[PDB]
Amino acid sequence: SGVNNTKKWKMEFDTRERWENPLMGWASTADPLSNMVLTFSAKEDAIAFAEKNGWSYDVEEKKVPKPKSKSYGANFSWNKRTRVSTK
Amino acid sequence: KTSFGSLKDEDRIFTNLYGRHDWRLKGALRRGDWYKTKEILLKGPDWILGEMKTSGLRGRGGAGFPTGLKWSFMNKPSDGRPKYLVVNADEGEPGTCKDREIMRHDPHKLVEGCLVGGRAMGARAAYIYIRGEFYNEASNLQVAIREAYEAGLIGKNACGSDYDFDVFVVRGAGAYICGEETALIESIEGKQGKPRLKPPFPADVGVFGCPTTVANVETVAVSPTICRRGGTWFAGFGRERNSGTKLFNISGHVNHPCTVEEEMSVPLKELIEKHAGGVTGGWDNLLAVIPGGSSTPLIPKSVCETVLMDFDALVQAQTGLGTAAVIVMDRSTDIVKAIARLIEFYKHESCGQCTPCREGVDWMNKVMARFVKGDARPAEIDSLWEISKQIEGHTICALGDGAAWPVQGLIRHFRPELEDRMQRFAQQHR
Amino acid sequence: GALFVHRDTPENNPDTPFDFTPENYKRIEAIVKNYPEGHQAAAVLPVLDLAQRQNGWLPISAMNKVAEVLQVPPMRVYEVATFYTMYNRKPVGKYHIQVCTTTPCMLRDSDSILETLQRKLGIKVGETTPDKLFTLIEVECLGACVNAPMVQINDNYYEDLTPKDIEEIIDELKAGKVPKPGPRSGRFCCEPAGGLTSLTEPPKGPGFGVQAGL
Ligand SMILES: Cc1cc2nc3c(=O)[nH]c(=O)nc-3n(C[C@H](O)[C@H](O)[C@H](O)COP(=O)(O)O)c2cc1C
Ligand code: SF4
Ligand code: FES
């Protein structure tokens, strides 16, 4: 339920091929940018950083949970379906 | 006046306390019940609530809230929902048996009290929730209710007052927590007796989600007499803000354990000696008293000498009036084992809903069991004190608080007795 | 000891026969009508209690029948049957002896009553006699502490007991007689022994002390 990891903008690269190492079975790669993650304070900072480095980018809008109406008293309604059968 | 006690039989309300007169309607009428009820009803809600406010009556279920203020939360225009009065007859606090006598010997006082109180709140019916173990009392109460229906005193056109009122009896199935006012409402609604959080308050959202007042049997039963004889008469007993008469249960180590009606603010010493026949073996044999039932902390013999039995006086003694159930322990008693068995009760009675009481009370119970043997070290006494303070004030309902206070009463007044057992246990093994 | 999970057995399973007798069905619809329309889950505690008064105890089939009769989910009936301690989810004896051992009773020697019952019946608390006529358990306060020590046997209270008194009550039940509820000490209910200290005067009659203008 913690939300502390949904507060900063992140830049990550497109995932590339990983393959099995014949000796040990380890996951091998040829992608030098496979672990690169950059943190940004604003969407506009991240866009600016990608553009000067010549990287094509896709930007997705931040999703905030919608405000909700919580009423503990609704659990005991006279005539509504919100009445809970158990506690 | 500054001296209280020596109540006269003319001023007693529960005149058939001991079941020596007929408990049916014929006897109840002779004793003055159901007299001028139609007159009281037609004087209206505001007048009735005025009498209860003037009398200074306070809750008899344990918490002692001013009754007239509480009952006035229902004095509001309806919103299309029915209005209800619940009468708490669960009576499950160890040491308390006062409500049991009202229902079996003065059932028509309670039924009339339901109507007068139900009218003042504007309620359509009364649900009396009685503990399941009180089967014979529940059947006495239904016989009285049937008699009142046949005589026109309740039901359609109650007492000829053009006001409709029903009185249903619902029985519990064995749970002390169902005496908590919102756990009782849930149990009526067919659920586990788990208390609700507040808000909402029952006067807003109660049983079936409707405006409700939960009132104690003793609170409800004395209301018709307060209206007939007036709030000034009732306010003439006990200290200010602690007025009226009260039913006391004296049990434990007394010569004559009994139930008796006495004026409020009566000295605790006078109550035990006059009515209960004194402490088993003399006043000097007294060790400690639990003055309000299990939930109230014990006090030692030194405090008991001068303490008055009313709400404010026992608050200054670091305990409380509670249900006015006096439990007496003489010096032959194992004080630690006595309080440990009370923690064992609360552990068996926790509804389990909320973390501090579900886990904490069970934790306190285990530590107390080790304190009885002395299988602990004195550093744990302060640990148990802190654990009880973590439960208190942090739970949904007052059961958690009522479990913490007995521990604190023991630690406050009998720390040397605990540390002495730990010393004996350590040397008995080392 | 007393578990809160059901596991099927031949004697207790969903096919164990249970039904309400026709007389008890008339009693159910009186119970249900005590509540607002559309709030008939309120009838679970009485109806579930009625199934046990007919049957003595509650197999899973009896709980399932209550849920169907009231059209509540069975889990909501199971929750109730496992919460309230008066429902017997295992069979009990003909006489269910319940001895209070809370502190007000313990101070007046409820331990002696429990010891006498164990040795007399030859069982321990929580067990049933081999002939299945008594079950013995300890209970919390029954609201009769001034009349301690006391026991409940089915719907009746037997109070102000001594080891000799409890033996008599056990003999009467083995014989087939009903002992009689109440104190076994000489007093009638909750009065102080040795004479009333209050309410010795006649009641004052109708209209006494009424305020003027009422
Ligand atoms: C665990 C617990 C048990 C209670 N048991 C009872 C009871 O058996 N009878 C009662 O009148 N109040 C009992 N109360 C107090 C009620 O919650 C409530 O305050 C009271 O019944 C109604 O208010 P009144 O006394 O002013 O009339 C209990 C409270 C708690 C926390
Ligand atoms: S304090 Fe105890 S009895 Fe009260 S709601 Fe919490 S767990 Fe239940
Ligand atoms: S302590 Fe036994 S009946 Fe109350």
Strand-pair partners of A9: A40
Judged by CB atoms closer than 8 Å, whether chains meet at A73 and B205 is answered as yes
Kindly state the tokens that stand for B226.
């307060």
Judging by DSSP bridges, how do beta strands B308-309 and B266-267 pair with one another?
A: antiparallel
- How far, in Å, is the centroid of ligand 3 from the Cα of C146? 8
- How far, in Å, is the centroid of ligand 1 from the Cα of B366? 27
Kindly state the tokens that stand for B255.
């010569």
Q: How far apart are CA C204 and CA B426, in angstroms?
A: 64
Residue type, B308: L
Same domain, B117 and B264: no
Query: Which atom of ligand 1 is nearest to B397's Cα?
Result: 31
Q: Are B34 and B111 in contact (CB under 8 A)?
A: no
Q: What crossing angle do the helices spanning B415-429 and B379-391 adopt, rounded to 10°?
A: 130
The secondary structure of residue B165, as a DSSP letter, is B
Same domain, B170 and B274: no
Closest CA to B278 of B326, B334, B335: B326
Which residues on chain A are in Cβ contact (under 8 Å) with C75? 86
Q: Phi then psi for A51, rounded to 5 degrees? A: -65, -40
Q: How far apart are CA B178 and CA B185, in angstroms?
A: 8
Counting the structural domains of chain B, the total is 4
Is the CB–ligand 2 distance for residue B395 below 6 Å? yes
Tell me: cis bond preceding B257? Omega within 30 of 0 counts: no
The shortest CB-CB distance from B81 to any of A72, A73, A78 is to A78
Other CB atoms within 10 Å distance of the CB of residue B372: 17
Q: Are C162 and C170 in contact (CB under 8 A)?
A: no
Q: How far apart are CA B380 and CA B415, in angstroms?
A: 11
Q: How many CA atoms lie within 13 A of C188 on its CB side?
A: 10
Which residues on chain A are in Cβ contact (under 8 Å) with B81? 78
Same domain, B293 and B371: no
Q: How far apart are CA B133 and CA B144, in angstroms?
A: 19
Is the CB–ligand 1 distance for residue B181 below 6 Å? yes
Q: How far apart are CA B94 and CA B113, in angstroms?
A: 25
Q: Where are the beta strands (DSSP E) in B93-176?
A: 125-130, 166-171
Kindly state the tokens that stand for B113.
């009290």
Smallest CA–CA distance, residue B81 to chain C, in Å, is 11
The answer to whether the annotation marks B304 as part of a ligand binding site is no
Contacts of A57 (CB under 8 A, 6+ apart): A11, A46, A47, A50, A51
Q: How far apart are CA C194 and CA C200, in angstroms?
A: 13
Q: Are B325 and B95 in contact (CB under 8 A)?
A: yes
If you write DSSP's letter for every residue of B190-253 in order, what string do you get?
A: TS---PPPSSSPTTTS-GGGS-EEEEEHHHHHTHHHHHHH-HHHHHTSSSTTS-SEEEEEEEES
Q: Are B350 and B399 in contact (CB under 8 A)?
A: yes
What secondary structure, in 3-state letters, does chain C show? CCCCCCCCECCECCCCCCCCCHHHHHHHHHHHCCCCCCCHHHHHHHHHHHHHHHHCCCCHHHHHHHHHHHCCCHHHHHHHHHHCCCCCCCCCCCEEEEEECCHHHHHCCHHHHHHHHHHHHCCCCCCECCCCCEEEEEECCCCCHHHCCCEEECCEEEECCCHHHHHHHHHHHHHCCCCCCEECCCCCCCCCCCCCCCCCCCCCCCCCCCCCCC
Q: How far apart are the first and last CA of chain B?
A: 60
Question: Which chain B residue has its CA at the smallest distance from A75's CA?
Answer: B209
Q: How far apart are CA B69 and CA B201, in angstroms?
A: 14
Q: How far apart are CA B102 and CA B89, in angstroms?
A: 10
Classified as helix, coil or strand, B379 is helix
Judged by CB atoms closer than 8 Å, whether chains meet at B92 and C86 is answered as no
Q: What percent of chain A is helix, strand and coil (3-state, nearest 5)?
A: 15, 15, 65
Beta-carbon contacts below 8 Å between B and C:
236
Is the CB–ligand 2 distance for residue B404 below 6 Å? no
Judged by CB atoms closer than 8 Å, whether chains meet at C106 and B342 is answered as no
Q: How far apart are the first and last CA of chain C?
A: 61
**What letters, b where the CB count within 10 A reaches 16 and e where it falls short, cover B147-173?**
bbbeeebbbeebbebebebbbbbbbbb
Is the CB–ligand 2 distance for residue B52 below 6 Å? no
Experimental technique: cryo-EM
The residue range of the domain holding B362 is 334-429
Other CB atoms within 10 Å distance of the CB of residue A77: 15
Which residues on chain A are in Cβ contact (under 8 Å) with B204? 73
Judged by CB atoms closer than 8 Å, whether chains meet at A87 and B197 is answered as no
Kindly state the tokens that stand for A70.
């919580």
Question: CATH number of the domain that B272 lies in?
Answer: 3.10.20.600
The answer to whether the annotation marks C189 as part of a ligand binding site is no
R_g over Cα of chain B: 22
Is the CB–ligand 1 distance for residue B97 below 6 Å? no
Closest CA to A46 of A8, A15, A14: A8
Q: Are B16 and B33 in contact (CB under 8 A)?
A: no
Counting the structural domains of chain A, the total is 1
Classified as helix, coil or strand, B386 is helix
The residue range of the domain holding A36 is 1-87
Closest CA to C121 of C109, C133, C138, C105: C133
